[PDB]
Amino acid sequence: QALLFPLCLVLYTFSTYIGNMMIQPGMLAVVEQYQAGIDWVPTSMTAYLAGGMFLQWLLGPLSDRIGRRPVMLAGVVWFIVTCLAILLAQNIEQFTLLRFLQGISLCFIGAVGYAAIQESFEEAVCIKITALMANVELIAPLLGPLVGAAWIHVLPWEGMFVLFAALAAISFFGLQRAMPETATRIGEKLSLKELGRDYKLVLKNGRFVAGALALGFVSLPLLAWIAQSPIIIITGEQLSSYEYGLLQVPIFGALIAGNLLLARLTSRRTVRSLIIMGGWPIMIGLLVAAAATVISSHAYLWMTAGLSIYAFGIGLANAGLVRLTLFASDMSKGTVSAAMGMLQMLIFTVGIEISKHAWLNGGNGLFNLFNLVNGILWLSLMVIFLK
Ligand SMILES: O=C(N[C@H](CO)[C@H](O)c1ccc([N+](=O)[O-])cc1)C(Cl)Cl
Ligand SMILES: [Pr+3]
Ligand SMILES: [Pr+3]
């Protein structure tokens, strides 16, 4: 009778995710409205993700000391305010700063929201909620760009931010009445020296770092495609909004297909064999995209096929590498999760920006060549990581 709590956390999580996914196709309308160059399109996502890594390391220990309730509720409010505030941005620089401020809201989901879930419910009921949250993460990158392309076809980009704020408001009120206080160290002081030392400690573990870096590198081509596909397809190939959306279907559908095969194979395959199994489509897909576009710069259908094959591999291999990276360090899971989360976002932010310059200077060929080296770096780390 009190399932309002995990339900409203799912709603909030969903809203921060479309806070990125719906926005990207709208970015072409944003830069036209500010009369800014196309180079600002991928940067919207870069700033959002950079904000997502800013406070990651702090919120867990802090909410443990002052309460999961006030910290979680504060994050929801912060998202509401920054979503509305971007309506007042006067140039693309100001717009990009607010994307960064919005992205900080991402830190509250894992470090305090999910921490509260694990502390409240039975381990059997905890699996049901976790699975549901995983479903949302899988559905957002498919539906997001589709709904976002449909939105700006009829409605202003500003309207999307009003929608994000509204969904988060509903989420606030449910959390305000249903979230219990579960923080275990209320009243205790926080030492930033002890906290910083815990992070130096996790980063000393070479096998943990290899796994965490590998997760960043291997996912980068997907994230770069989310960031840049509007300018690649619409301004680069001179195609329509409809085709932009159509090309998302084989890519994110393959990702889903990869995850469903994972579920069917899990009882009769170890984590290690699934990573190796995914490596074939990961490497072949990225090779196909690169070879085709070097031969012919405008072979965007070959590019899309290569990325779908690669995306299938990710669906099969990623969750297993997450699990193994998590247990590669014997330290507290709060510290480990936050560390691996920050390492992968560091790669995403820097990688998208490199990817942007690669595309601007050399087109689809360079875009896909850079994705290929990221695949090679994942593979290089797995030869070491797996033993
Ligand atoms: O895009 C992915 N998701 C992972 C983890 O969910 C990635 O770390 C990520 C996290 C948050 C995010 N966002 O809300 O902007 C995007 C990617 C795929 Cl690699 Cl599954
Ligand atoms: Pr310490
Ligand atoms: Pr400690």
Work out the end-to-end distance of the chain between its first and last CA atoms, rounded to an integer number of angstroms.
Answer: 48
Q: What amino acid is encoded at 87 in this protein?
A: L
Ligand nearest to the CA of 202: 2
Both tokens of 347, joined, read 């790669």
Q: Which of the 8 DSSP states describes residue 180?
A: P
Q: What amino acid is encoded at 321 in this protein?
A: L
Distance of CA 311 to the CA centre of its chain: 14
User: Among residues 208, 19, 203, 195, which one has the least CA distance to residue 104?
Assistant: 19
Judge if the beta carbon of residue 44 lies within 6 A of ligand 1: no
CB 109 within 8 A of CB 16: yes
Judge if the beta carbon of residue 5 lies within 6 A of ligand 1: no
Both tokens of 293, joined, read 């576009």
- Answer positive or negative: Cα dihedral of 289, 290, 292, 294: positive
Degrees, nearest 5: CA angle 282-352-162: 110
* CA separation for the pair 139, 59 (Å, rounded): 27
Judge if the beta carbon of residue 135 lies within 6 A of ligand 1: no
Both tokens of 357, joined, read 């310059």
* CA separation for the pair 140, 15 (Å, rounded): 9
* CA separation for the pair 174, 257 (Å, rounded): 33
Ligand nearest to the CA of 194: 2
Both tokens of 119, joined, read 């502390």
* CA separation for the pair 42, 46 (Å, rounded): 7
**Ligand 1 atom nearest to CA at 138:** 20
Judge if the beta carbon of residue 137 lies within 6 A of ligand 1: yes
Task: Provide CB contacts within 8 A for 149, sequence distance 6+.
Answer: 25, 241, 244, 245
* CA separation for the pair 106, 101 (Å, rounded): 10
Ligand nearest to the CA of 64: 3
What CA–CA distances, in Å, run from 185 to 36, 63, 86, 188, 310?
Answer: 49, 9, 36, 6, 44
* CA separation for the pair 7, 5 (Å, rounded): 5
**Ligand 1 atom nearest to CA at 226:** 1
Ligand nearest to the CA of 65: 3
**Ligand 1 atom nearest to CA at 341:** 8
Task: Provide CB contacts within 8 A for 271, sequence distance 6+.
Answer: 320, 321, 323, 324
PDB experimental method: X-ray
What spacing in Å lies between the alpha carbon of 197 and ligand 3's midpoint? Answer: 8
Judge if the beta carbon of residue 344 lies within 6 A of ligand 1: yes
Q: How many CB atoms lie within 10 A of CB 171?
A: 23
Question: Dihedral (C-alpha) 264, 270, 272, 278: value to the nearest 10 degrees?
Answer: -20
Number of domains in the chain: 1
What spacing in Å lies between the alpha carbon of 359 and ligand 1's midpoint? Answer: 22
* CA separation for the pair 172, 61 (Å, rounded): 22
The DSSP annotation for 258-316 comes to HHHHHHHHTTSS-HHHHHHHHHHHHHHHHHHHHHHHHH-TT-HHHHHHHHHHHHHHHHH
Q: Burial-class residue 301 by CB neighbours within 10 Å (0-12, 13-18, 19+).
A: exposed
Mutate which of 109, 223, 314 for ligand 1 pocket (most atoms within 8 A of beta carbon): 223
User: Among residues 56, 43, 55, 97, which one has the least CA distance to residue 351?
Assistant: 43
Judge if the beta carbon of residue 248 lies within 6 A of ligand 1: no
* CA separation for the pair 231, 292 (Å, rounded): 19
Buried-state track 122-153, b at ≥16 Cβ within 10 A, e below 16: eeeebeebeeebeeeebebbbbbbbbbbebbe
Can you give the residue range of the structural domain that contains 176? 1-387
CB 357 within 8 A of CB 224: no
Q: What amino acid is encoded at 330 in this protein?
A: D
Q: Where are the alpha helices (DSSP H) in 153-205?
A: 157-178, 192-204
Q: Which of the 8 DSSP states describes residue 181?
A: P
Both tokens of 184, joined, read 């275990």
Judge if the beta carbon of residue 378 lies within 6 A of ligand 1: no
The DSSP annotation for 301-341 comes to HHHHHHHHHHHHHHHHHHHHHHHHHHTSS-S-HHHHHHHHH
Judge if the beta carbon of residue 20 lies within 6 A of ligand 1: yes
CB 317 within 8 A of CB 282: yes
Mutate which of 219, 325, 371 for ligand 1 pocket (most atoms within 8 A of beta carbon): 219
- Answer positive or negative: Cα dihedral of 198, 203, 204, 207: positive
CB 82 within 8 A of CB 102: yes
Residue with the smallest CA separation from ligand 1 atom 18 is: 219
Q: Burial-class residue 369 by CB neighbours within 10 Å (0-12, 13-18, 19+).
A: middle
Degrees, nearest 5: CA angle 210-213-215: 110
Both tokens of 261, joined, read 């095969």
Both tokens of 324, joined, read 């193994």
Judge if the beta carbon of residue 46 lies within 6 A of ligand 1: no
What CA–CA distances, in Å, run from 67 to 60, 107, 182, 187?
Answer: 10, 16, 7, 9
Name the residues around ion ligand 2, CB cutoff 5 A. 194, 197
Judge if the beta carbon of residue 219 lies within 6 A of ligand 1: yes
What CA–CA distances, in Å, run from 106 to 102, 292, 305, 317?
Answer: 8, 37, 31, 24
* CA separation for the pair 275, 260 (Å, rounded): 15
* CA separation for the pair 340, 203 (Å, rounded): 10
* CA separation for the pair 87, 159 (Å, rounded): 9
Judge if the beta carbon of residue 13 lies within 6 A of ligand 1: no
CB 46 within 8 A of CB 352: yes
What spacing in Å lies between the alpha carbon of 140 and ligand 1's midpoint? Answer: 10
CB 224 within 8 A of CB 352: yes
Q: Burial-class residue 11 by CB neighbours within 10 Å (0-12, 13-18, 19+).
A: middle
Cα radius of gyration rounded to whole Å, the chain: 21
What CA–CA distances, in Å, run from 302 to 205, 287, 295, 309?
Answer: 40, 11, 11, 11
Task: Provide CB contacts within 8 A for 11, sequence distance 6+.
Answer: 167, 168, 170, 171, 174
